Ligand binder design. Sequence first.
Ligand code: 5X4
Length: 288
Amino acid sequence: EAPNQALLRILKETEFKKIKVLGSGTVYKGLWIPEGEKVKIPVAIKESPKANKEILDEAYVMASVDNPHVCRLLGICLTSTVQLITQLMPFGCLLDYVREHKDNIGSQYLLNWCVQIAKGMNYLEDRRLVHRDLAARNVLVKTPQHVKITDFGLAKLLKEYHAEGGKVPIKWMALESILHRIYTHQSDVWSYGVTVWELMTFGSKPYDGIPASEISSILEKGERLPQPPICTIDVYMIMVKCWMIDADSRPKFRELIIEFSKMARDPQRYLVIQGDEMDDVVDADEYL
Ligand SMILES: *CCC(=O)N1CCCC[C@@H](n2c(NC(=O)c3cccc(C(F)(F)F)c3)nc3cccc(C)c32)C1
């Protein structure tokens, strides 16, 4: 158990401008200007004692991660509403993005999102972190060519995690987790499988028209999400393996990287889609 020497940066509130509300749990668009640095960083600003301790837990995890497919923490601002400041992801969450652009999303984009998400998750596994809330809504889009995993509030650091009775997304959850509140990197792989299904259906809702309470018995009887129309058996077999009952039968993220990478070199063999064929601004990824 190695010492976590990550730096937590406190930001002066006078160092940034809130341009606009992005969504609302409120997120703002903004510009961070470290004083006398002559850079402007576009940022997202996520703005009760319980609220404060939970948001500081998230800041803790986000400050201990540094990977190109993991969300970046720039710093915090100490106010009574205690803001998280991160890199601005100008295209929003990936689930809204596939819903909005489904008629122009080709197989190349789909398979490389799958690669990049697997890279993010494999990195979180290397740092012994279990995300516990992986879903297309929690993947942000920096560019159509570059996505990052976000939302580490539920994440817990480590062989298994025994949780309490807080509210949980049953439809993205492994079955061990629904029944026994157990979470592992392999229960994260299950959520990855639902995530890929979300993408391949262009953002359909898993088990739509079913309440969370029946899900556990459905999965016990052997039922799974259907094969998306665009999906070859090759791709759909990968989802199904992510949904094995035996968690060590599920793929590892490093294996998922390899498989989707192979498929990304010939994407039309694996997905069938009709028609597939401010001067001082600095991106946060370049401000080190
Ligand atoms: C699926 C919901 C969605 O589109 N979101 C999530 C919540 C609202 C913000 C939306 N948005 C952003 N977000 C971010 O840039 C961002 C960065 C880091 C962390 C977070 C988080 F998780 F805390 F919320 C958000 N950027 C844009 C740009 C344009 C449009 C939208 C809607 C947008 C994304």
